Amino acid sequence: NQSVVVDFLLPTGVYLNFPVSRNANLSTIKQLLWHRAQYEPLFHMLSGPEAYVFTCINQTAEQQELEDEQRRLCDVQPFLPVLRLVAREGDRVKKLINSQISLLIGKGLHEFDSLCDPEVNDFRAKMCQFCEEAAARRQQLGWEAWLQYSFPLQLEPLLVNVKFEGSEESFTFQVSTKDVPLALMACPEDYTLQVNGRHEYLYGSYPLCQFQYICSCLHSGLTPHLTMVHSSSILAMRDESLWSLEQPFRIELIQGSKVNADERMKLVVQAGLFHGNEMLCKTVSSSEVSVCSEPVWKQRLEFDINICDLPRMARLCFALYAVIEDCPIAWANLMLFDYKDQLKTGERCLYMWPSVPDEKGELLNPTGTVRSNPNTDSAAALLICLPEVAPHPVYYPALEKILELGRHSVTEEEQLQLREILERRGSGELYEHEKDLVWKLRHEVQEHFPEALARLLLVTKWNKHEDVAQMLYLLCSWPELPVLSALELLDFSFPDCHVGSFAIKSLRKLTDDELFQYLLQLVQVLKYESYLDCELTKFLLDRALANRKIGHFLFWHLRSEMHVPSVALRFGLILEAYCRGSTHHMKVLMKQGEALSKLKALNDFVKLSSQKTPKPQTKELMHLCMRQEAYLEALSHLQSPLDPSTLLAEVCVEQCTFMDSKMKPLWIMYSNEEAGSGGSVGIIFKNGDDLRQDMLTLQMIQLMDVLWKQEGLDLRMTPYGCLPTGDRTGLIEVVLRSDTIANIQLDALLNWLKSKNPGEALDRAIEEFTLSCAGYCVATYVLGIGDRHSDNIMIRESGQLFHIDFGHFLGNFKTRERVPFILTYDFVHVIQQGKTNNSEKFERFRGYCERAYTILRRHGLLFLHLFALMRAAGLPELSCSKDIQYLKDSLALGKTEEEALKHFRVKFNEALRESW
Amino acid sequence: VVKEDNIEAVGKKLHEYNTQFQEKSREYDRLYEDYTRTSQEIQMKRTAIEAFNETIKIFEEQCQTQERYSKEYIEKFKREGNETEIQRIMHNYEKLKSRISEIVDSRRRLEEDLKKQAAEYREIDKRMNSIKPDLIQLRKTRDQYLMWLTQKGVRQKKLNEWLG
Ligand SMILES: C[C@H](Nc1ncnc(N)c1C#N)c1nn2cccc2c(=O)n1-c1ccccc1
């Protein structure tokens, strides 16, 4: 029904109720309200319309003050149609923000308050102050600083058509490759240079050659367009009691709750202490109580370790099994110490997570989150009591008191063996004899092998407190390590906060471009952090508040996992603090979410109508929905989530279509008269598949493309954008001028690349095809991408090959085999350009594959480190050291450079056989 | 663990257990879709009740206000010669109260939904916790057979045929 009966609550206590249109705005509603009010009691006591402001209850179940009266009623989307008038004056600043944050992150901010949790409360206090604090320092800075923040420089690893702002007519000047932005603005310092129809500005001390736009203009074969921008235009946008306790650690296991186990079986609760992955001591186990919904054990579970021997990140881990006189029911982990450093005491209810069947099935799940199960009403839980250890409570010792142990408390033979022992292979496992070597020459490690910190940490006995002091003493005076070495230290294997701190300190030298390359991995590391208030989160917020691209993509990485109970709280709290320090960007992100909300709703209609109607008519039925007042304005004029510099202005409803295949992805086309001749963006909305593995894959192909460019090989890759935005939802960037091999192939493939760019530019298109084939053949080989065929590889009109729909990787495939290198015979023909025995070209191609692969080996450990961190993400195809071992074998890291290069040559030639 | 003597017999059973495993593993995955979708729906209902609660709260704030304001208004303007707007004011307030019952009733209908769904959710979780031990044993039995045959040198071609 197009109109809605709405309840109106006047401030006198008077109640009015009548229909309005769903698409009517609040300003109009108020005019109709007043007109009706006349004919009710107490009208004369009311002030005028403008003295009041509507209130409603959100979809998130919170009171919202509707300050902006241009919003439509259907867009406000109140729970029930109930509007209540209140005084327009009323400290609105914090009110309207909190409202937006809730509707933007999806979770209501009241849901944090309701937890009655001091850790949560502290976090929200400290960070929202910090992010506000940052924001204020942003506004305090001038025009140069804010431009740097707003839109950072997009840089690489003829003529120029400049023009003055606010003018249709322009003047086509000419400039060559190398020239500085100051030198450009000469042919000044008050202005800046801006790319036409995009939020992308040229500034700083870099030359014109090193900017992405100017480079991108050359290979397409087109003239650029830039624009001068006065500071007024920029500012307009800117404005708008110690470890003496030698008592063995014990815990009381009291009772369970809400257990949905089988009645004939029997319940048992196994448990164990852990420092990350390693066991502090052996696992104890409960008595076999009969299966109740409310079981009762009442046992003192004493462990083989003292309270004085517990490390800061000691973690007790529980698991409830069910046995026929075995079924894992549920698991739940606890940190022994708390977030303010106190050793926990008293009763504690552990709301447990349900046990997913693994292929292996370990005793407990120590890797699993310390975060509680939010589903407290329905979840099973375990009542336990952590006892009173001393008459007044105890904290973990302070750094000064830790340093006191090292404060007061070398053979040439020993030395030479350590050089061998610590210089050798990737890792594997050292022996207890050699572990003592590493512990013995542990200062000599700090003095001569600074980058072997990870190995020394592993060999440290974390179940003995004297060793923990000795280690942490050395770590405090440890020399700064590289980024590569630092990323390794971020892995779950090193839980101690001092390692985490040292890691982040070494990561602080990261440039923003480099930090962006690892952001996905850094976000996943949050998942296994112990406490909310941590140095990684502070790091990410600090960097997000300083760089709006970092902040943008930080937002979406977190937003897109808000539907996951294990991270919802943590990520929700970060998004809140990000929003508070980024009030302007909050508005852009809102218009995106509102777009995304509409695209899901639009995709639902295509999903219903595709099952009934045929394809050509359903396309027109999609348009009819898109032409509407709500669907047009919400989809129009927004920054792309895939690239906030891209401006998606006017939707091309006629050009918009869909694929009637599987998850019915929607093809949304955009046009805008500012961008240029090739100024039409496209985006693929897609709901039903999980895009995270797709994103990892593409990002890893990006990194390959960067690494090759640094060493001087441009393999003409197409690293098109892919952003998960929600629960099995995201955008993929449309690549224009392209088609599948299948559709071209339905002798034929050679004729297509001839037609688009004939004559002289054909040889360039062959050079584009050969160059990109090299890259994508190595990339897919190294990453182990399988199920590669006609309909999931595309070719661009320029010549460039690129891959799509990365379903599987690292050898994984059906319900797991080593992927051979793949030269397709069709593709080999195009490289040999028609002729049969074209050794000239094909030797140079193989020459490039050998080079590409070699460069990737040199940064092998980077890929291992990044993939290591992604084990956190819980992707089914990347969940263990064996999935990582795939890359070690594909990059051939354990062999010499000569050995790997010949191994690759053998695999190449093995492919060249199977071609025929 | 292996209850057969000859390769071909053992291989035939390997096929049964692998087929049993794959069928059961599918039944669990089917129930896991139901389970998780239900959690999602429950979480939605649970917040919708919060929205009802918070809406009813707003309606009761009106009721407090009209009571107070009516009383104050009547006293300032005496209720003397002017009594025409009192029956109006009171009749409006009957409508206000009457609307609150409708809303209170809807909350009551949703709560009864949430309760029915919550019991389904628990029945899903019961069903999967009885599947779990079967799934684990069938996996462990399947593997024992694959071992047995591999130890005996049976060729991968025969094993692939038995796993299809
Ligand atoms: C199959 C293709 N996928 C992509 N196309 C363009 N850019 C991309 N980044 C992708 C991807 N992934 C593609 N995807 N798609 C989703 C919805 C509609 C379409 C579509 O029409 N094509 C398509 C088919 C033939 C030729 C050209 C395009």
Tab-separated table of N, CA, C and O in Angstrom, chain A residues 544-613:
chain	number	residue	atom	x	y	z
A	544	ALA	N	44.090	5.608	9.942
A	544	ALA	CA	42.789	5.879	9.294
A	544	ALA	C	42.344	7.350	9.422
A	544	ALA	O	41.825	7.934	8.462
A	545	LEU	N	42.550	7.933	10.607
A	545	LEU	CA	42.254	9.349	10.844
A	545	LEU	C	43.198	10.298	10.098
A	545	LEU	O	42.840	11.449	9.878
A	546	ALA	N	44.393	9.830	9.729
A	546	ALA	CA	45.365	10.630	8.970
A	546	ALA	C	45.239	10.470	7.446
A	546	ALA	O	45.740	11.315	6.700
A	547	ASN	N	44.587	9.398	6.986
A	547	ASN	CA	44.469	9.103	5.555
A	547	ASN	C	43.071	8.583	5.249
A	547	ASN	O	42.685	7.525	5.739
A	548	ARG	N	42.332	9.297	4.409
A	548	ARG	CA	40.935	8.956	4.178
A	548	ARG	C	40.732	7.696	3.314
A	548	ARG	O	39.707	7.036	3.438
A	549	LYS	N	41.691	7.360	2.455
A	549	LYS	CA	41.650	6.078	1.739
A	549	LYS	C	41.787	4.927	2.748
A	549	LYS	O	40.968	4.008	2.761
A	550	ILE	N	42.799	5.004	3.614
A	550	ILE	CA	42.976	4.004	4.677
A	550	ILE	C	41.691	3.893	5.497
A	550	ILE	O	41.167	2.801	5.657
A	551	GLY	N	41.171	5.035	5.957
A	551	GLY	CA	39.900	5.093	6.699
A	551	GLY	C	38.695	4.515	5.965
A	551	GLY	O	37.922	3.749	6.542
A	552	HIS	N	38.548	4.870	4.690
A	552	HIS	CA	37.491	4.326	3.829
A	552	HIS	C	37.508	2.814	3.818
A	552	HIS	O	36.525	2.165	4.150
A	553	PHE	N	38.640	2.257	3.431
A	553	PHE	CA	38.743	0.823	3.273
A	553	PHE	C	38.802	0.129	4.615
A	553	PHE	O	38.321	-0.999	4.734
A	554	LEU	N	39.336	0.800	5.634
A	554	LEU	CA	39.234	0.281	6.999
A	554	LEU	C	37.768	0.151	7.394
A	554	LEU	O	37.379	-0.858	7.993
A	555	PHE	N	36.963	1.161	7.054
A	555	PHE	CA	35.538	1.132	7.359
A	555	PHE	C	34.884	-0.107	6.774
A	555	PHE	O	34.256	-0.884	7.501
A	556	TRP	N	35.030	-0.281	5.465
A	556	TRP	CA	34.352	-1.391	4.772
A	556	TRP	C	34.846	-2.784	5.180
A	556	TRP	O	34.033	-3.703	5.301
A	557	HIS	N	36.145	-2.933	5.437
A	557	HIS	CA	36.654	-4.223	5.908
A	557	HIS	C	35.935	-4.630	7.180
A	557	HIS	O	35.508	-5.777	7.302
A	558	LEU	N	35.783	-3.682	8.106
A	558	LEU	CA	35.091	-3.931	9.375
A	558	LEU	C	33.583	-4.046	9.173
A	558	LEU	O	32.965	-4.990	9.671
A	559	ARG	N	32.989	-3.105	8.442
A	559	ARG	CA	31.538	-3.125	8.212
A	559	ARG	C	31.052	-4.454	7.641
A	559	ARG	O	30.041	-4.997	8.064
A	560	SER	N	31.810	-4.986	6.694
A	560	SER	CA	31.442	-6.211	5.990
A	560	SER	C	31.509	-7.484	6.835
A	560	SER	O	31.044	-8.528	6.378
A	561	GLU	N	32.084	-7.413	8.038
A	561	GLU	CA	31.999	-8.525	9.018
A	561	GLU	C	31.162	-8.240	10.293
A	561	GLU	O	31.211	-9.012	11.258
A	562	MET	N	30.363	-7.173	10.284
A	562	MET	CA	29.492	-6.842	11.430
A	562	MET	C	28.408	-7.888	11.715
A	562	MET	O	27.927	-7.992	12.837
A	563	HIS	N	28.040	-8.658	10.701
A	563	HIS	CA	27.146	-9.806	10.855
A	563	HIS	C	27.763	-11.040	11.557
A	563	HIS	O	27.055	-12.020	11.777
A	564	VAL	N	29.052	-11.001	11.899
A	564	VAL	CA	29.743	-12.138	12.529
A	564	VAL	C	29.853	-11.941	14.057
A	564	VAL	O	30.596	-11.069	14.520
A	565	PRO	N	29.119	-12.751	14.845
A	565	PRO	CA	29.083	-12.561	16.297
A	565	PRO	C	30.437	-12.461	17.009
A	565	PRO	O	30.552	-11.723	17.996
A	566	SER	N	31.444	-13.187	16.530
A	566	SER	CA	32.743	-13.210	17.202
A	566	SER	C	33.473	-11.875	17.107
A	566	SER	O	34.239	-11.543	18.012
A	567	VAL	N	33.227	-11.120	16.033
A	567	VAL	CA	33.846	-9.796	15.815
A	567	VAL	C	32.895	-8.584	15.917
A	567	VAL	O	33.370	-7.449	15.988
A	568	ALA	N	31.581	-8.811	15.915
A	568	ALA	CA	30.591	-7.716	15.894
A	568	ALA	C	30.869	-6.611	16.929
A	568	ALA	O	30.939	-5.424	16.590
A	569	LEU	N	31.056	-7.012	18.179
A	569	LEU	CA	31.376	-6.063	19.237
A	569	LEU	C	32.658	-5.312	18.913
A	569	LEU	O	32.641	-4.085	18.813
A	570	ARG	N	33.753	-6.045	18.708
A	570	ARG	CA	35.062	-5.401	18.513
A	570	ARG	C	35.065	-4.422	17.360
A	570	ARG	O	35.519	-3.299	17.509
A	571	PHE	N	34.577	-4.868	16.213
A	571	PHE	CA	34.583	-4.055	14.999
A	571	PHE	C	33.593	-2.910	15.116
A	571	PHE	O	33.870	-1.799	14.651
A	572	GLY	N	32.442	-3.181	15.732
A	572	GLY	CA	31.463	-2.139	16.010
A	572	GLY	C	32.069	-0.983	16.797
A	572	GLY	O	31.921	0.183	16.410
A	573	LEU	N	32.778	-1.303	17.880
A	573	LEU	CA	33.428	-0.279	18.690
A	573	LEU	C	34.465	0.538	17.889
A	573	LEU	O	34.566	1.749	18.084
A	574	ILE	N	35.207	-0.102	16.979
A	574	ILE	CA	36.210	0.615	16.170
A	574	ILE	C	35.541	1.552	15.162
A	574	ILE	O	35.903	2.726	15.059
A	575	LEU	N	34.574	1.025	14.423
A	575	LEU	CA	33.771	1.840	13.509
A	575	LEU	C	33.181	3.084	14.208
A	575	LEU	O	33.248	4.189	13.665
A	576	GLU	N	32.645	2.902	15.416
A	576	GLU	CA	32.133	4.027	16.186
A	576	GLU	C	33.209	5.103	16.368
A	576	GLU	O	32.997	6.258	15.992
A	577	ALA	N	34.358	4.722	16.928
A	577	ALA	CA	35.467	5.667	17.125
A	577	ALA	C	35.971	6.263	15.803
A	577	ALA	O	36.303	7.446	15.770
A	578	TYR	N	36.001	5.468	14.721
A	578	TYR	CA	36.379	6.003	13.401
A	578	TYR	C	35.426	7.095	12.962
A	578	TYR	O	35.867	8.168	12.527
A	579	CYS	N	34.125	6.794	13.058
A	579	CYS	CA	33.053	7.746	12.725
A	579	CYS	C	33.159	9.060	13.490
A	579	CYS	O	32.957	10.122	12.911
A	580	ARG	N	33.482	8.988	14.779
A	580	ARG	CA	33.555	10.192	15.608
A	580	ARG	C	34.693	11.104	15.177
A	580	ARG	O	34.548	12.332	15.210
A	581	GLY	N	35.805	10.506	14.749
A	581	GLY	CA	36.938	11.266	14.222
A	581	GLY	C	36.831	11.616	12.747
A	581	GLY	O	37.740	12.239	12.196
A	582	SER	N	35.733	11.217	12.102
A	582	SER	CA	35.562	11.392	10.663
A	582	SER	C	34.104	11.698	10.333
A	582	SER	O	33.410	10.909	9.708
A	583	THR	N	33.660	12.868	10.770
A	583	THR	CA	32.262	13.277	10.653
A	583	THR	C	31.861	13.572	9.215
A	583	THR	O	30.747	13.257	8.814
A	584	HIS	N	32.762	14.179	8.446
A	584	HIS	CA	32.518	14.432	7.021
A	584	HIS	C	32.383	13.119	6.259
A	584	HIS	O	31.401	12.908	5.553
A	585	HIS	N	33.368	12.243	6.416
A	585	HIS	CA	33.379	10.966	5.696
A	585	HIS	C	32.203	10.053	6.063
A	585	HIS	O	31.797	9.212	5.253
A	586	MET	N	31.675	10.223	7.276
A	586	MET	CA	30.448	9.555	7.730
A	586	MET	C	29.270	9.762	6.762
A	586	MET	O	28.506	8.832	6.509
A	587	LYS	N	29.149	10.964	6.204
A	587	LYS	CA	28.084	11.275	5.240
A	587	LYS	C	28.256	10.535	3.907
A	587	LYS	O	27.285	9.998	3.362
A	588	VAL	N	29.483	10.509	3.385
A	588	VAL	CA	29.788	9.768	2.149
A	588	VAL	C	29.488	8.282	2.313
A	588	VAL	O	28.818	7.680	1.476
A	589	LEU	N	29.970	7.708	3.410
A	589	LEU	CA	29.721	6.296	3.727
A	589	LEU	C	28.223	5.968	3.894
A	589	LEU	O	27.792	4.853	3.580
A	590	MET	N	27.438	6.936	4.376
A	590	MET	CA	25.994	6.756	4.514
A	590	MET	C	25.327	6.625	3.149
A	590	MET	O	24.547	5.703	2.931
A	591	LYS	N	25.648	7.532	2.230
A	591	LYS	CA	25.092	7.483	0.865
A	591	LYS	C	25.461	6.179	0.134
A	591	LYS	O	24.692	5.706	-0.701
A	592	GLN	N	26.624	5.610	0.458
A	592	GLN	CA	27.036	4.320	-0.089
A	592	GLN	C	26.175	3.186	0.454
A	592	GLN	O	25.582	2.437	-0.327
A	593	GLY	N	26.091	3.076	1.782
A	593	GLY	CA	25.245	2.073	2.443
A	593	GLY	C	23.801	2.137	1.973
A	593	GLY	O	23.162	1.107	1.771
A	594	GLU	N	23.296	3.354	1.785
A	594	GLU	CA	21.949	3.575	1.249
A	594	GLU	C	21.825	3.105	-0.207
A	594	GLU	O	20.773	2.614	-0.614
A	595	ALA	N	22.898	3.262	-0.982
A	595	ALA	CA	22.990	2.666	-2.316
A	595	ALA	C	22.961	1.149	-2.198
A	595	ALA	O	22.167	0.477	-2.852
A	596	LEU	N	23.817	0.630	-1.328
A	596	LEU	CA	23.984	-0.816	-1.158
A	596	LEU	C	22.713	-1.505	-0.689
A	596	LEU	O	22.404	-2.612	-1.131
A	597	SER	N	22.000	-0.837	0.215
A	597	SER	CA	20.692	-1.274	0.689
A	597	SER	C	19.698	-1.400	-0.471
A	597	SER	O	18.958	-2.386	-0.553
A	598	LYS	N	19.703	-0.409	-1.364
A	598	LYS	CA	18.822	-0.407	-2.536
A	598	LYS	C	19.187	-1.489	-3.556
A	598	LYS	O	18.297	-2.108	-4.140
A	599	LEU	N	20.484	-1.716	-3.761
A	599	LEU	CA	20.959	-2.741	-4.706
A	599	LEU	C	20.607	-4.175	-4.288
A	599	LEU	O	20.244	-4.985	-5.135
A	600	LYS	N	20.724	-4.477	-2.994
A	600	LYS	CA	20.219	-5.736	-2.407
A	600	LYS	C	18.725	-5.884	-2.686
A	600	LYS	O	18.283	-6.897	-3.231
A	601	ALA	N	17.962	-4.854	-2.323
A	601	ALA	CA	16.517	-4.819	-2.579
A	601	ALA	C	16.182	-4.980	-4.068
A	601	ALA	O	15.201	-5.644	-4.414
A	602	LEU	N	16.998	-4.378	-4.936
A	602	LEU	CA	16.814	-4.483	-6.387
A	602	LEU	C	17.176	-5.881	-6.867
A	602	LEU	O	16.470	-6.451	-7.702
A	603	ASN	N	18.269	-6.425	-6.329
A	603	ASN	CA	18.720	-7.784	-6.664
A	603	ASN	C	17.702	-8.848	-6.225
A	603	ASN	O	17.556	-9.869	-6.900
A	604	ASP	N	17.006	-8.603	-5.108
A	604	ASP	CA	15.916	-9.483	-4.656
A	604	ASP	C	14.813	-9.588	-5.711
A	604	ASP	O	14.286	-10.682	-5.944
A	605	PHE	N	14.467	-8.459	-6.338
A	605	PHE	CA	13.417	-8.420	-7.372
A	605	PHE	C	13.825	-9.185	-8.627
A	605	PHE	O	13.008	-9.892	-9.208
A	606	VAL	N	15.084	-9.038	-9.036
A	606	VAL	CA	15.642	-9.827	-10.139
A	606	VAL	C	15.652	-11.326	-9.800
A	606	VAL	O	15.350	-12.152	-10.661
A	607	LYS	N	15.977	-11.665	-8.552
A	607	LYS	CA	15.951	-13.064	-8.085
A	607	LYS	C	14.548	-13.705	-8.090
A	607	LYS	O	14.410	-14.890	-8.403
A	608	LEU	N	13.524	-12.927	-7.742
A	608	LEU	CA	12.135	-13.402	-7.786
A	608	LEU	C	11.628	-13.508	-9.228
A	608	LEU	O	11.071	-14.535	-9.617
A	609	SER	N	11.840	-12.448	-10.008
A	609	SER	CA	11.338	-12.358	-11.390
A	609	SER	C	12.063	-13.249	-12.407
A	609	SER	O	11.468	-13.619	-13.421
A	610	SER	N	13.335	-13.568	-12.158
A	610	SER	CA	14.092	-14.487	-13.029
A	610	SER	C	13.543	-15.917	-13.000
A	610	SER	O	13.588	-16.617	-14.013
A	611	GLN	N	13.031	-16.337	-11.841
A	611	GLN	CA	12.409	-17.661	-11.683
A	611	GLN	C	11.065	-17.816	-12.415
A	611	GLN	O	10.634	-18.944	-12.656
A	612	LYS	N	10.416	-16.696	-12.751
A	612	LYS	CA	9.144	-16.693	-13.492
A	612	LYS	C	9.319	-16.251	-14.952
A	612	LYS	O	9.055	-17.029	-15.875
A	613	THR	N	9.768	-15.008	-15.145
A	613	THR	CA	9.842	-14.375	-16.474
A	613	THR	C	11.138	-14.709	-17.235
A	613	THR	O	12.114	-15.147	-16.623
